[PDB]
Amino acid sequence: GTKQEKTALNMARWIRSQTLTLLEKLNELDADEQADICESLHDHADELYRSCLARFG
Amino acid sequence: GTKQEKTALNMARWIRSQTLTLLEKLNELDADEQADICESLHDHADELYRSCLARFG
């Protein structure tokens, strides 16, 4: 796809990566409730990233 | 609230902000299906930010 489409796809990938950074940080804090929501948030970011990749890849 | 707590809260805030930015890019692209998943992702990141906020302060 177009450069704008590629920038969007890159941003979806960066967000998916950042959820794992935050997951590890919440694990270090032993913040279990929040780590759980962040695990699901990584799954949701992956859903977006895959949808973007299928369309803009 | 400790440095690590503050790093985690700010990271949750950043992820919420980046998903808002990505949703606007996806809207500019008129990529409907992707914008819809991103809207749901943005709300999920808000939940994480608010969950961190209610726990950590």
Q: Which chain B residues touch A8 with a CB distance below 8 Å?
A: 22, 25-26, 29, 31, 34
Token output for B3: 């440095």
Annotated resolution, angstroms: 1.8
3-state DSSP helix/strand/coil % of chain A, to nearest 5: 90, 0, 10
Residue with tokens 């699901």: A40
Q: How many residues does chain A have?
A: 57
Question: DSSP character for A41?
Answer: H
Contacts from A35-38 at CB under 8 Å and sequence distance 24+? A37/B44, A37/B47, A37/B48, A37/B51, A38/B12, A38/B48
Angle of helix B3-28 relative to helix A3-28, nearest 10 degrees? 160
Spell out the domains of chain A, with CATH numbers in brackets: 1-57 (1.10.287.230)
What's the rounded Cα separation, in Å, for the pair A31 and B30?
38
The single-letter code of the amino acid at A4 is Q
All residues at 6 or more sequence positions from A20 whose CB lies less than 8 Å from its CB, including other chains: A42
Residue B8, min C-alpha distance to chain A (Å): 6
